[PDB]
């Protein structure tokens, strides 16, 4: 009962921008976040130069899998896929080689919010539909280069935030704000880019490689203000559809946006053609779900419809099961954060992990939901977007002030290691 099922995929994850550092190094092009940090707000975890140290941390914890992201501007400084930066290509190939040697399966994310600055300047980034084809070129290059030792792929990490914080609130790069059409045009392009990459993979790479490709959709959970009030519940459903349903319906559903959304955003939300509806759907090989701090904080992140934000991971999983025909689910990101001043005794992180892991096991055994994997979020402390170093998400502690930047396991790291050994608690 308390132990997880046999053959359960345990893993940890990171993002390129958060941990890599070396933003100028070896001919890497600047990203929109690079520009954003200089304009609106070092070296972080220095993973680029301390790759061996990260691998030791992975070894220590005992994870069966590792999720990282490839920096698009580190491969192609100008965005366009012509001649890749050879030093950057070796780093990601070395990492994959490193992981295969220690039987650790990689999950590779093509896009973790670091759009090359060149593309944003020249075309307006995800506002232009031109970059759908450029993104496909980038994805194509990656499947050719890394696909023989990669079985798991994620095209875009949390497209909701990319579109909403990037163009709705301005809290994320590129910092655009005040045009709701831009928000939804960006979401349209993100969805289309993902579908095109999936079709590309399915046709050209799947027969030889036989991998699994998805998109990581993040969300929050909401509970009614009055437990039985049906109107409250209806408002909750709207909140869920506004975040999760926006991308999940086109991709895991009928190929079109939620009906509620189409009425509400009549002259703003773009229209999918009938041909497009067929091509958008069925383009994810699993349901990659993100349930973390990015979808809960700050309070302008989501529309609550005046209801109660909730951290019920179990209920969220049931929502996916009911709305999206009970799919296989991988927890693409899960965890919480601590204050920067908390170094190694992160008791809250252990509680949080224990809280969340118990809910996942509940969902498998009691609710018959096919969650086959779990990615604990943040291998090491890094640069947490607008929050920078004010918060900490890692299992391993990193002193940014120190030149050495050694990875020091926290209580959560020892706990997660324990959890994997016992495959439960």
């Amino acid at each position: 009962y308390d132990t997880f099922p046999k053959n359960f995929f345990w893993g940890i994850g990171t993002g390129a921008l958060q941990v890599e550092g070396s933003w100028k190094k070896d001919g890497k092009g600047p990203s929109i976040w690079d520009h954003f940090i200089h304009t609106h707000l070092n070296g972080s975890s220095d993973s680029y130069i301390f790759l061996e140290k990260d691998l030791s941390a992975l070894d220590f914890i005992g994870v069966s899998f590792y999720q990282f992201s490839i920096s698009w501007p580190r491969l192609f400084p100008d965005g366009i896929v012509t001649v890749a930066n050879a030093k950057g290509l070796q780093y990601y190939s070395t990492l994959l080689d490193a992981l295969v040697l220690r039987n650790i399966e990689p999950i590779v994310t093509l896009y973790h919010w670091d759009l090359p600055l060149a593309l944003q300047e020249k075309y307006g980034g995800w506002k232009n539909d031109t970059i759908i084809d450029i993104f496909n070129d980038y994805a194509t290059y990656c499947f050719q280069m890394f696909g023989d030792r990669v079985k798991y792929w994620i095209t875009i990490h949390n497209p909701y935030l990319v579109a909403w914080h990037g163009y709705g609130t301005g809290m994320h790069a590129p910092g655009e704000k005040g045009n709701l059409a831009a928000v939804y045009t960006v979401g349209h392009n993100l969805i289309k880019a993902h579908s095109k990459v999936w079709h590309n993979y399915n046709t050209h790479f799947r027969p030889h490689q036989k991998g699994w490709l998805s998109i990581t959709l993040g969300s929050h959970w909401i509970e009614p203000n009055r437990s039985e009030n049906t109107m409250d519940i209806f408002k909750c459903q709207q909140s869920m559809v506004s975040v999760l349903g926006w991308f999940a319906n086109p991709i895991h559903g009928d190929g079109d946006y939620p009906e509620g959304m189409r009425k509400k955003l009549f002259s703003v939300l773009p229209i999918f053609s009938e041909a497009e509806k067929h091509e958008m759907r069925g383009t994810a090989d699993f349901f990659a779900f993100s349930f973390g701090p990015n979808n809960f904080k700050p309070l302008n992140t989501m529309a609550k419809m005046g209801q109660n934000v909730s951290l019920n991971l179990r209920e969220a999983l049931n929502w996916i099961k009911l709305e999206y025909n009970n799919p296989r689910i991988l927890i693409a990101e899960n965890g919480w954060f601590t204050d920067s001043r908390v170094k190694t005794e992160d008791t809250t992180a252990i509680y949080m992990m224990k809280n969340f892991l118990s809910q996942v096991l509940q969902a498998i055994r009691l609710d018959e939901i096919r969650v086959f994997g779990y990615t604990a979020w943040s291998l090491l402390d890094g640069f947490e977007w607008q929050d920078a170093y004010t918060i900490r998400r890692g299992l391993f502690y990193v002193d940014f002030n120190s030149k050495q930047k050694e990875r020091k396991p926290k209580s959560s790291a020892h706990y997660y290691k324990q959890i994997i050994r016992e495959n439960g608690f």
Partner: antibody, heavy 123, light 109 residues
């Protein structure tokens, strides 16, 4: 590499019958096994599945709550226990091995099938 | 649940002809979870295609698989005498797992 369905026979409507499937030529506990049935003259219909350690089981709606799928890895045997049987349940039952082995990340598919065992439900 | 609907119920063609079988799903599913099976009278089913397009062990090149979302297609480029049988589409993408009605390919004469 084989699967053998056993325990088929005749059962009074409303009575209970147990089935067994024997496996050899591969590591039993590394695979998931399905139960698929076929009524005379009709199409294949999925009944149930059980996975590697025996704790995870999934069923079809029609048979849900009546049939109980189980396995004994030491004995290399899988069982389908069916109760409250009906005329519609009269069919040939197959045990099928799923290709998606443990730690492999293979696509799902039923690759190895048994001959079948016929169950008739009549008084 | 995902209901798979097969068309046509029966296909009548001569040997050496191309056969095109279709499988429609009520809800969208990943190609990764779609399989085709062949069953001859008095025989147990045989896995032909898994993951929409991948041929099963010992399956000849004439058998092809394709499709995405809600539409999947099984194709036999040049029919042979052994090929005439009944074909079923199956999906594991959603639980509960389902089978199609079946399509019977018979010999036209």
């Amino acid at each position: 590499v084989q699967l053998v369905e056993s325990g088929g026979g005749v059962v009074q409507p409303g009575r209970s019958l147990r089935l067994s499937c024997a496996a050899s030529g591969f590591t039993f506990s590394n695979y998931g096994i399905h139960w698929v049935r076929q009524a005379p003259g009709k199409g294949l219909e999925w009944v149930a599945v059980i996975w590697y350690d025996g704790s995870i089981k999934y069923y079809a709606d029609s048979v849900k709550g009546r049939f109980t799928i189980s396995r004994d890895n030491s004995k290399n045997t899988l069982y389908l226990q069916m109760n409250s049987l009906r005329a519609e349940d009269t069919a040939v039952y197959y045990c099928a091995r799923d290709r998606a082995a443990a730690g492999l990340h293979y696509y799902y598919g039923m690759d190895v099938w048994g001959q079948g065992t016929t169950v008739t439900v009549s008084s | 649940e995902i209901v798979l609907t097969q068309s046509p119920g029966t296909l009548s063609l001569s040997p050496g002809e191309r056969a095109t079988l279709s499988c429609r799903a009520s809800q969208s599913v990943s190609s990764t979870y779609l399989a085709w099976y062949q069953q001859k009278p008095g025989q147990a089913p045989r896995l032909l295609i898994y993951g929409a397009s991948s041929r099963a062990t010992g399956i000849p090149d004439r058998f092809s698989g394709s499709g995405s979302g809600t539409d999947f297609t099984l194709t036999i480029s040049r029919l042979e005498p052994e090929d005439f049988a009944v074909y079923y589409c199956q999906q594991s993408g959603s639980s509960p797992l389902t089978f199609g009605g079946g399509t019977e390919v018979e010999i036209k004469r």
